[PDB]
Design a protein around this ligand. Structure first.
Ligand code: FE
Ligand code: FE
Ligand code: FE
Ligand code: FE
Lengths: 96, 96, 96, 96
């Protein structure tokens, strides 16, 4: 019923994220998604490279984020990872 | 010629940010905007409250961000602050 | 030969971290440990709760960190996690 | 009576921080120092360069941090900056 999975929408090299796609995860001082990280998986080396990290103060912002990936052609996929204090990490992989 | 100021676009309580509005600031390992922070200035108390912080690894992402402000009516303005390693902090205030 | 594992030293509720214990991991713009996160595993609920995150700009700081855990008795263990851009995540668990 | 100023202790290039020096600032979900950032002021260029940022989840950790400054001789001073949600930013400069 409650959704943690970081939806990814890709426009060129721009990536918009929300948790989750249809229902927005709670945003309170005691229940929150604190970070949304975006990783690129590299072609040259199969590295899981963190591109950046949206940190959100509990109950001050809802779990959205956006990134703009440098040199997108360098990656074979994107991995978004959302962290909820109560419910742990939830990831979503997009194949490029 | 080069722009650091974090453009803010507001859609309801959603805030899209890019540095800068017309020209995108460089994104390299030696020249980067490392963080984009969003603050709300509170009505009740005149506090400058950090809502969250988009951290970006040098040269891996371009300086964009988005936030979704909880309880937007609680604030009288939004303050975006971009940090460039070479050129320091650049802010932009939006009156609500 | 090269060490990524976050050494933990515990003094009361104070936690000192370095990667690694004997050899300090490189700190350059192209090879770095970017974050050191500390998690507490809760007794009440078996939750893996992120206590905080030391972010370090590539080549500007070496991979050390410290935390001071609130209400330490509430946890059954601490989990430190270091992220290296080239070599991924490395964790270390301490049973309390 | 309540202290926000980030005490700095320097051992070689190692920097230990606590807010404040004698009294530890509160650490609760509604009152917290959320970040402790360390800046180096460069000789070559007078730049205020962020070395890193200790982020702490409200009420999960007390406001301490440590850094280890790469190439310390390159700076003329260190600037620590603590952010409290209720009381704003508090800085402390150390001349090298
Ligand atoms: Fe949750
Ligand atoms: Fe710049
Ligand atoms: Fe490494
Ligand atoms: Fe305070």
């Amino acid at each position: 019923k409650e959704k943690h999975v970081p939806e990814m929408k890709l426009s060129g090299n721009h990536v918009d994220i929300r948790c989750g796609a249809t229902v927005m995860h709670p945003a309170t001082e005691k229940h929150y998604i604190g970070t949304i990280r975006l990783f690129g998986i590299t072609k040259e080396g199969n590295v899981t490279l963190e591109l950046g990290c949206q940190q959100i103060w509990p109950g001050l912002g809802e779990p959205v984020a956006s990134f703009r990936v440098c040199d997108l052609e360098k990656y074979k996929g994107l991995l978004a990872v959302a962290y909820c204090n109560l419910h742990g990490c939830w990831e979503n992989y997009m194949e490029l």
